[PDB]
Design a binder for this molecule. Structure first.
Ligand code: 03Q
Length: 286
């Protein structure tokens, strides 16, 4: 397919940093205003500024992510609006007014419904399904890396650890990593596949269904491998029916072939979203 994605290379003076939004992976994200050259409009943006010390490998990876994320793809992935190539690379994207899903669920704990949670799980799966189709392994999928455009619309973002797989490459061999969201084979053998993304997807869904609890809270990160090989997993969130929790459990099978495919997670969460109260018992949050 002719990939007519437009990539904008912006001068730094088109951007104004207005507020610090938080940290992404390997970079600081700012709220700002992009005034595109030749235009008088003030567009609300997020601007992620990466480390200043970047190796060739890193620059190549940044440009891969940019090659994929510039496309008009899924509505459930954040689109790269443009890059500013100063000494330090700045990545520019549409500002999502409701911030990251992790904060959103924590601070809307009392008001979020079954339908919301299930829609988000579906949309994240749809986003990841799409990334799978474009050969991108995220390696860092987590509630902190999903954004809320609006209550009914989430987007996978950041992509700080994302790797584009070449033709007939099926694993990335890996640098600091999110241990508590990682598949066992990723922790132990630094192998990253779309199937180890499914594991991270399961922890994301756990995060949402617990309203942003910390996975394995108080458990040191060094004990996580051992814990997982001894068959422990994250416990059933109070609001999950066994239906929903079983899918999570399936994401955390030690054999990566026994984990769901993202297209199956799409269909399973779409089915459940149709009758949300049957699969998420929201009253159990009390
Ligand atoms: O970084 C994890 C979540 O960010 C919370 C900060 N935040 C709050 C509102 C908001 N709106 C838009 N973006 C945010 N953060 C953000 C995250 N990642 C970014 O980097 C990329 C975005 C898209 C595509 C790519 C790349 F490299 F794949 F092309 C990087 C940016 Cl710029 C902003 C927000």
């Amino acid at each position: 397919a002719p990939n007519q994605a437009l990539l904008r290379i912006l001068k730094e003076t088109e951007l104004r940093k207005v507020k610090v939004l938080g940290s992404g992976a390997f970079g600081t994200v700012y709220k700002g205003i992009w005034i595109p050259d030749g235009e008088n409009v003030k567009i609300p943006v997020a601007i992620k500024v990466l480390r200043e010390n970047t190796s060739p490998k890193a620059n190549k990876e940044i440009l891969d992510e940019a090659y994929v994320m510039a496309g008009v793809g899924s509505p459930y992935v954040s689109r790269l609006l443009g890059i500013c190539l100063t000494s330090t690379v700045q990545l520019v994207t549409q500002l999502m007014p409701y911030g990251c899903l992790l904060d959103h669920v924590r601070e809307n704990r009392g008001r979020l419904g079954s339908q919301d949670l299930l829609n988000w799980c579906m949309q994240i799966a749809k986003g990841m399904s799409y990334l799978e189709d474009v050969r991108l392994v995220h390696r860092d999928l987590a509630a902190r890396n999903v954004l809320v455009k609006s209550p009914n619309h989430v987007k996978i973002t950041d992509f700080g650890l994302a790797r584009l797989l070449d033709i007939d490459e099926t694993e990335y061999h890996a640098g600091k990593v999110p241990i508590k969201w990682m598949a066992l084979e990723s922790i132990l053998r630094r192998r990253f596949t779309h199937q180890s993304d499914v594991w991270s997807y399961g922890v994301t869904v756990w995060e949402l269904m617990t309203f942003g609890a910390k996975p394995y809270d108080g458990i040191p990160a060094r004990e996580i491998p051992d814990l997982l090989e001894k068959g422990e997993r994250l416990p059933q969130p109070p609001i999950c029916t066994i239906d929903v929790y079983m899918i999570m459990v399936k994401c955390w099978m030690i054999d990566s072939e026994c984990r769901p495919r993202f297209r199956e997670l799409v269909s399973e969460f779409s089915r459940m979203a149709r009758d949300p109260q049957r699969f998420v018992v929201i009253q159990n949050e009390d």
